[PDB]
Amino acid sequence: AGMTTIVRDLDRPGSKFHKREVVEAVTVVDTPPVVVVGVVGYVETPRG
Amino acid sequence: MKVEIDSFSGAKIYPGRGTLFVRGDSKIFRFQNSKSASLFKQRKNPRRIAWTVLFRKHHKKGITEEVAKKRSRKTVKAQRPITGASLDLIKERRSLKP
Amino acid sequence: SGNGAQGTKFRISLGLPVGAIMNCADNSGARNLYIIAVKGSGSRLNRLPAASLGDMVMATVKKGKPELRKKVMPAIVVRQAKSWRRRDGVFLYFEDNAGVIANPKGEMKGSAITGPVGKECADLWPRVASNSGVVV
Amino acid sequence: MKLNISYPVNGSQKTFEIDDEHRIRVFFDKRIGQEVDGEAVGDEFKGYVFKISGGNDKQGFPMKQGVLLPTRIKLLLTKNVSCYRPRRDGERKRKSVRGAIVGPDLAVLALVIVKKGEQELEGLTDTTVPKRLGPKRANNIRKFFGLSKEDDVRDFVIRREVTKGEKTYTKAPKIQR
Amino acid sequence: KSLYTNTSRKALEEVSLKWIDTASKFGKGRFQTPAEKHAFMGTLKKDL
RNA sequence: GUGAACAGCCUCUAGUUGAUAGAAUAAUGUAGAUAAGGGAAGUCGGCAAAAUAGAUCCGUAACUUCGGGAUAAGGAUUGGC
RNA sequence: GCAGUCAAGCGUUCAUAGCGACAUUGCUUUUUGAUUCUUCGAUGUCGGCUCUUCCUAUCAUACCGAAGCAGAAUUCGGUAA
RNA sequence: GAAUGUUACCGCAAUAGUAAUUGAACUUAGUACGAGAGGAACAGUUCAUUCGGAUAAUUGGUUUUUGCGGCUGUCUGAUCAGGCAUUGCCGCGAAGCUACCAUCCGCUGGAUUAUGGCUGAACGCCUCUAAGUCAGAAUCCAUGCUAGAACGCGGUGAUUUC
RNA sequence: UGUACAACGGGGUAUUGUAAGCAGUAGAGUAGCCUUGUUGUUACGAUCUGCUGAGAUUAAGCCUUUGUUGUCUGAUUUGU
Ligand SMILES: [Mg+2]
Ligand SMILES: [Mg+2]
Ligand SMILES: [Mg+2]
Ligand SMILES: [Mg+2]
Ligand SMILES: [Mg+2]
Ligand SMILES: [Mg+2]
Ligand SMILES: [Mg+2]
Ligand SMILES: [Mg+2]
Ligand SMILES: [Mg+2]
Ligand SMILES: [Mg+2]
Ligand SMILES: [Mg+2]
Ligand SMILES: [Mg+2]
Ligand SMILES: [Mg+2]
Ligand SMILES: [Mg+2]
Ligand SMILES: [Mg+2]
Ligand SMILES: [Mg+2]
Ligand SMILES: [Mg+2]
Ligand SMILES: [Mg+2]
Ligand SMILES: [Mg+2]
Ligand SMILES: [Mg+2]
Ligand SMILES: [Mg+2]
Ligand SMILES: [Mg+2]
Ligand SMILES: [Mg+2]
Ligand SMILES: [Mg+2]
Ligand SMILES: [Mg+2]
Ligand SMILES: [Mg+2]
Ligand SMILES: [Mg+2]
Ligand SMILES: [Mg+2]
Ligand SMILES: [Mg+2]
Ligand SMILES: [Mg+2]
Ligand SMILES: [Mg+2]
Ligand SMILES: [Mg+2]
Ligand SMILES: [Mg+2]
Ligand SMILES: [Mg+2]
Ligand SMILES: [Mg+2]
Ligand SMILES: [Mg+2]
Ligand SMILES: [Mg+2]
Ligand SMILES: [Mg+2]
Ligand SMILES: [Mg+2]
Ligand SMILES: [Mg+2]
Ligand SMILES: [Mg+2]
Ligand SMILES: [Mg+2]
Ligand SMILES: [Mg+2]
Ligand SMILES: [Mg+2]
């Protein structure tokens, strides 16, 4: 869909940027639920 | 999470947005965008650039109902009296005359 | 970097490739620092080894007290001007690139430091921390 | 942070403390003097209108009426003005000070009460303290008691009783003018 | 999903978003909500 | 007409609108441009390119065959009404 | 140019930790010579830029054996491109 | 891209390619070792180098959006709106492209080499070796990843009447 | 023949930085007629000001839409 910015506190015991805000980049994927419409089955064969 | 404003333009600077400029006198300048930040470098006067926050404030533009009051008074009036003389003797004996 | 520098350093946009000349900001006598190298830098055919805040370079003095000229010495970048970006999303930059002459173990040479100094630099260099009036 | 709440009508004052920063955020971007409904600060305070009077930030620096900003500035301060008690004659000094607009960098927030809510706040609305002194000049006694210049002061003044252990005594002011 | 299980630490950290940028992305966006835009420049020739 | 001007740039008279055409806008090119921070580290070499540029006023070094050097260098300033 | 064997000697002591004389056995074809087979009805003749790949007689990086290896540093060697 | 009845959808995987690299700080620890001077390493943590594949929230670059604004000449009587000067010049400029100049992400199982070992004869002793055998490397084979054999393949839908 | 699709028009978004027109006691000032001034007056004056964050452009690879108009059977080919 696109991307955007995010702000959050950082939990990372060790970093000079621990417990401090970090602006970060993120991507939003559109995910309206999927409909199941079939089932297919697979076997082991000595050639695939 | 502060939201500084453009020292020139005037609008808000949500996190990570625009640039920041530390001058030699160690004074900080934030710009929402390249536009102001250039018009800043270009020695332009904020009070001359019409859309700027500083322009409208100096030229008395769009204020309307802030151009009126509100409501912020109260009530008090009691008697804590003078201290060290029985504070009850100062409400009673205050019988007045006129 | 490497010796004397207590701390790490998150990556900041390199702004001073070798041969760059930056304002010296201490009472050493030196007026400028001319970068001949960068401590810690890596190798790739035809890359100039560049410098950023809190970096320790190797430099000389172009214009300064004659007892600093004609010889190589450490120096520490304190002002960038090449707009770098921090982990709080800020795209900030000083008005000029600048640095102070220092020693191997990483201590100052002059009394104080004239002008601003990045946090990135002070946090790394205990000795700088002192002299640096305003920071960031 | 911390709120120093004062009741002017009753001379009361208590220093309450609030974490839960979403509670505090009512105060943000509010100038010195702007009023504040109580239910936003808590429930104990519901109703109680609050006038914003002063306060302090980290490192202790004071606010100052009419400076705007939510930050520190270094002003030249004179006689007859806030945050500066001059030492020498016509002495001006350049000192730092905090902006008038509230932010999350304040150690304390000096509030006053304008109106009362649906709960008697403990060390505030319930408890009372006495105006530590009383009228001293002539027509100030007369106008504290409303007398019409007839009723002869002399005894229309307050008299403080102070016990000398085993010799309780009577000391009055001294009516000037 | 993931074909392994990352002890990572760098992943493991449950993060909590403070704020998500909703200013326009069709240029130099300034205001989050159409309210915030109004609560700033106020009333215009169309508008009110 | 602008301008020191037969320069550039626009126009009047006169004369032209002649040079295969259509559709797209991949790589690579020929020609024209701009780039953050650095500043010749590129290279045999600053090749190329960029910088400079009119005029009024101020200011001007070594050295000289005293004719020069010299727009030396370095500065300020310039519309409209 | 690189690698051996014998081991008189060096290494305080101790031939072979690390080295090695007098001799002698080899490998390599990025040196230079010797040759003159191929091209004189033309195989475009240095170097750099660039880009790929391969060799190992390994500079660094992985894991090891050895020391005249206390630690640190270094050295000799194995698997290793 | 013809041809293995037509057409469509979902897949398997031969063979082939293949990828990550190196450093530092904290900590260990002023520790072990040393009379002292000096002075480590495994585990853990935070960052970095070179490499690689992406991606455009932000920041920067780009400007024929000739989008808005300005300026110089001249031409349309002035006005309004405009034309011409190989895009006339100027400030700003969305979209797109794009930059360690921007941001993101770069898997873990096995088998071995050297080497050190167990058991153990030959050789009544001894020995990692002869039978047998354990542990082991930036190696190797997998895992993963990219292609998919247009003459390798499976599953499934639909299959025409003037 | 419909949650259709298209051309426009509308609203969001975005760029520039305040459109033309009109008005004004703004404006260095300036002309002319006297009825020669206890604002004489009518003009005219770079620029300014107000309606006016106004006007203008905004998908050409932005978002959206109860509005308007229109469009919806031409061709060729294939069989175990
Ligand atoms: Mg931009
Ligand atoms: Mg080179
Ligand atoms: Mg000199
Ligand atoms: Mg021709
Ligand atoms: Mg053509
Ligand atoms: Mg430009
Ligand atoms: Mg450049
Ligand atoms: Mg630029
Ligand atoms: Mg030079
Ligand atoms: Mg050179
Ligand atoms: Mg030469
Ligand atoms: Mg040369
Ligand atoms: Mg040239
Ligand atoms: Mg230029
Ligand atoms: Mg000359
Ligand atoms: Mg002038
Ligand atoms: Mg050789
Ligand atoms: Mg001997
Ligand atoms: Mg020995
Ligand atoms: Mg020959
Ligand atoms: Mg031939
Ligand atoms: Mg030939
Ligand atoms: Mg040839
Ligand atoms: Mg081989
Ligand atoms: Mg020994
Ligand atoms: Mg057939
Ligand atoms: Mg590498
Ligand atoms: Mg220590
Ligand atoms: Mg010892
Ligand atoms: Mg790329
Ligand atoms: Mg951009
Ligand atoms: Mg234009
Ligand atoms: Mg202009
Ligand atoms: Mg007009
Ligand atoms: Mg024409
Ligand atoms: Mg021409
Ligand atoms: Mg990269
Ligand atoms: Mg992978
Ligand atoms: Mg064996
Ligand atoms: Mg196939
Ligand atoms: Mg306006
Ligand atoms: Mg296209
Ligand atoms: Mg409509
Ligand atoms: Mg048939």
Instruction: Say how many Å lie between the CA of residue C43 and the centre of ligand 27.
Output: 10
Q: Are D11 and D5 in contact (CB under 8 A)?
A: no
Instruction: Say how many Å lie between the CA of residue B47 and the centre of ligand 34.
Output: 27
**B97, C24, C132, D32 from C106: Cα distances, Å:** 86, 16, 15, 48
Task: Please state, in angstroms and rounded to a whole number, the distance separating the CA atoms of residues D123 and D10.
Answer: 11
Token look-up 């300034």 returns: E30
Interface of B with A (CB under 8 A): 1, 15-16
The residue type of E16 is S
Tokens at residue E42, please? 């106020």
Report the Cα B2 to chain-centroid distance in Å: 16
Task: Please state, in angstroms and rounded to a whole number, the distance separating the CA atoms of residues B7 and D103.
Answer: 19
Token look-up 């332009």 returns: B44
Domain that holds residue D9: 1-130
Task: Please state, in angstroms and rounded to a whole number, the distance separating the CA atoms of residues C124 and C55.
Answer: 9
Q: Where does chain C show beta strands of DSSP type E?
A: 16-17, 21-24, 32-38, 50-51, 56-60, 73-79, 84-85, 91-94, 98-101
Q: Strand F closer than 7 Å to the CB of C57?
A: no
Tokens at residue E19, please? 């704020």
Task: Please state, in angstroms and rounded to a whole number, the distance separating the CA atoms of residues B21 and E18.
Answer: 26
In degrees, rounded to 5, the angle at the alpha carbon of residue D102 between the alpha carbons of residues D100 and D104 is: 135
Q: Strand F closer than 7 Å to the CB of C104?
A: no
- Phi, psi for residue D77 in degrees, rounded to 5: -110, 140
Tokens at residue E3, please? 């074909």
Task: Please state, in angstroms and rounded to a whole number, the distance separating the CA atoms of residues C118 and C86.
Answer: 11
User: Which chain D residues are closer than 8 Å to B12 by Cβ?
Assistant: none
Sequence-separated (6 or more) residues with CB below 8 Å from residue B13: B3, B4, B5, B6, B30, B31, B32
Q: Are C77 and C103 in contact (CB under 8 A)?
A: no
Hey, is B35 helix, strand or coil? Answer: helix
Closest by CA to E20, choosing from E11, E32, E29, is E32
- How far does the CA of D38 sit from the C1' of H99, in Å? 53
Token look-up 């921090």 returns: C86
Sequence-separated (6 or more) residues with CB below 8 Å from residue D109: D1, D2, D3, D4, D27, D52, D55, D102
- How far does the CA of C33 sit from the C1' of F10, in Å? 55
CB atoms within 10 A of CB C10: 11
Q: Strand F closer than 7 Å to the CB of C97?
A: yes
Q: Are C79 and C99 in contact (CB under 8 A)?
A: yes
**B33, B45, C95, C136, D77 from B27: Cα distances, Å:** 19, 18, 11, 10, 21
Q: Where does chain D show beta strands of DSSP type E?
A: 2-7, 12-17, 35-36, 50-57, 72-77, 93-98, 106-113, 160-162, 169-171
**C25, C35, C57, C64, C109 from C29: Cα distances, Å:** 10, 17, 19, 6, 10
- How far does the CA of D53 sit from the C1' of I76, in Å? 88
- Phi, psi for residue E34 in degrees, rounded to 5: -65, -20
**D156, E12, E13, E15 from E7: Cα distances, Å:** 85, 7, 10, 16
Tokens at residue D63, please? 């606010």
Task: Please state, in angstroms and rounded to a whole number, the distance separating the CA atoms of residues D81 and C6.
Answer: 47
Closest by CA to D107, choosing from D57, D61, D71, is D57
Closest by CA to C62, choosing from C21, C100, C26, C28, is C21
User: Which chain A residues are closer than 8 Å to C8 by Cβ?
Assistant: 16
Nearest residue to nucleotide I52 when comparing alpha carbons to its C1'?
Answer: E45
**A7, B74, C40, D18, D28 from D25: Cα distances, Å:** 18, 25, 46, 11, 5
Task: Please state, in angstroms and rounded to a whole number, the distance separating the CA atoms of residues D37 and D40.
Answer: 6
Token look-up 């403080």 returns: D160
Task: Please state, in angstroms and rounded to a whole number, the distance separating the CA atoms of residues D56 and D88.
Answer: 26
Task: Please state, in angstroms and rounded to a whole number, the distance separating the CA atoms of residues C39 and C128.
Answer: 18
D133: nearest CB among B82, B94, B97 = B82
| Burial per residue of B12-29, b for 16 or more beta-carbon CB atoms within 10 angstroms, e otherwise | bbbbbbbbbbbeeeeeeb
Task: Please state, in angstroms and rounded to a whole number, the distance separating the CA atoms of residues C107 and C124.
Answer: 12
- Phi, psi for residue E33 in degrees, rounded to 5: -105, 155
- Pairing between β-strand C32-38 and β-strand C21-24 as defined by DSSP bridges: antiparallel
Task: Please state, in angstroms and rounded to a whole number, the distance separating the CA atoms of residues C125 and C111.
Answer: 15
Hey, is B30 helix, strand or coil? Answer: strand
Residue C52, judged by CB atoms within 10 A of its CB (0-12, 13-18, 19+), counts as: buried
Q: Are D145 and D154 in contact (CB under 8 A)?
A: no
Q: Are A2 and A27 in contact (CB under 8 A)?
A: yes
Rounded to a whole number of angstroms, the CA Rg of chain A reads 22
Token look-up 């835009």 returns: E37
Ligand nearest to the CA of C17: 7
